[PDB]
């Protein structure tokens, strides 16, 4: 419906660029418009869209379609049954530089993460993060350069900084958690207390 309009808008706007993602996810959780929107983003449109989103710029006609196809894909998908561990590397800047440990923050653009740690270091060595979440979308079947096996988190998705540390090499090592998981998440029941830690 509103999807049929979007799927029509996307091939009108991006032609063969949009169409090449049709049927790339034969599982069928997402519609043609959603599959094409995430494809377009993951393949190359991440750069211009995330730049417009992080700068608070007006999205051009074509950017609006990709963003509305992705937002719709995240409304559909929702939270998964299991918590997933993904990885992310950035070069010069990171959304969570401004967030102190225990506090929550977000990226204004979309957060790309990888199921492979080695794949993340290949994107950046400024800051390497370990993410734990449930509301991410697996796009490895739509677009998968470097066999990145990407799990994308929605824009403005709130993440809690569990650890923010630095390497003797000067790499910041972060542990982020989807703030919606709660306080109980990531704790093996009774373990920390059993560990009889030498601290008041």
């Amino acid at each position: 419906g509103a999807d049929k309009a979007l799927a029509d808008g996307l091939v009108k706007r991006f032609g063969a660029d949009a169409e090449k993602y049709l049927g790339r996810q034969p599982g069928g959780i997402h519609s043609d418009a959603e599959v094409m929107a995430l494809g377009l983003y993951t393949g190359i449109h991440y750069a211009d869209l995330n730049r417009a989103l992080r700068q608070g710029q007006e999205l051009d006609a074509g950017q609006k379609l990709i963003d509305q196809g992705m937002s719709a894909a995240f409304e559909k998908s929702g939270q998964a049954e299991q918590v997933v561990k993904t990885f992310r590397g950035t070069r010069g800047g990171d959304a969570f530089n401004a967030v102190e440990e225990g506090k929550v923050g977000h990226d204004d653009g979309y957060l790309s993460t990888s199921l492979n740690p080695g794949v993340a270091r290949s994107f950046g060595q400024g800051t390497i993060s370990t993410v734990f979440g449930r509301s991410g979308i697996d796009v490895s079947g739509i677009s998968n350069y470097k066999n990145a096996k990407a799990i994308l988190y929605n824009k403005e998705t709130d993440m809690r900084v569990l650890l923010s540390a630095s390497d003797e090499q000067g790499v910041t090592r972060r542990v982020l958690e989807e703030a919606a998981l709660g306080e109980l998440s990531g704790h093996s029941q009774g373990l920390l207390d059993a560990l009889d830690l030498a601290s008041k």
Partner: protein
């Protein structure tokens, strides 16, 4: 008595904040000779942690009194007699858990994770003995603490991830042993630094079940390092 009965009594005792009951329940479960589950190990551990922990606190209070009131000889004889009553309770609690460790816990430990846990525990209770011991007995309790912590350290470094909460918890307690019991800021800082450095190098090894357990012990490791090395 039945295993699941004593375990439920221990879970009850925990809620009622009756840790001497909780420890006695888990002492019997252990004396049955059968390997404890992860739940039963943690119940035995939190039970004795609180049983011993209360006496450690009470000992640190009466000892702090003895210093600030070094006056009347009958008043000091009251303070000493009371410190020694608490010391005797400490030594009795520790011996009981060190007895459960050597006779039942360490020999029945199949997987390396539970072995490092019980060996770190043996290092802990020998360290608790060291805090109250003096002379020749101190030398022995200290050497036994270091040995049990080192044994656990070598097994963990070979069969566990640098982010494992049991490996990190061992690193924290062993470094604190060097700082408090051997008064070595250098050896303490070296253990904490290496353990933290090896854990941030391999954050990919974090478990989706115990990642917040790991990040918390990594914050205590780092926080100690900045405390031990930072000038005002």
């Amino acid at each position: 008595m039945d295993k699941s009965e004593l375990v439920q009594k221990a879970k009850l005792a925990e809620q009622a904040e009756r840790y001497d009951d909780m420890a006695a329940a888990m002492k019997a479960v252990t004396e049955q000779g059968h390997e404890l589950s992860n739940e039963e190990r943690n119940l035995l551990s939190v039970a004795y942690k609180n049983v011993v922990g209360a006496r450690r606190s009470s000992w640190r209070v009466i000892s702090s009194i003895e210093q600030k009131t070094e006056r009347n000889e009958k008043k000091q004889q009251m303070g000493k007699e009371y410190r020694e009553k608490i010391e005797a309770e400490l030594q009795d609690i520790c011996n009981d858990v060190l007895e459960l460790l050597d006779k039942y816990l360490i020999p029945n430990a199949t997987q390396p994770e539970s072995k490092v846990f019980y060996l770190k525990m043996k290092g802990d209770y020998f360290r608790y003995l060291s805090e109250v011991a003096s002379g020749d007995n101190k030398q022995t309790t200290v050497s036994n603490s270091q040995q049990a912590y080192q044994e656990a350290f070598e097994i963990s470094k070979k069969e566990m991830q640098p982010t494992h909460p049991i490996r990190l918890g061992l690193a924290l307690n062993f470094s604190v042993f060097y700082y408090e019991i051997l008064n070595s800021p250098e050896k303490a800082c070296s253990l904490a630094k290496t353990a933290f450095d090896e854990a941030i190098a391999e954050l990919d090894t974090l478990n989706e079940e115990s990642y917040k357990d790991s990040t918390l012990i990594m914050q205590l490791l780092r926080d100690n390092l900045t405390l031990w090395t930072s000038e005002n």
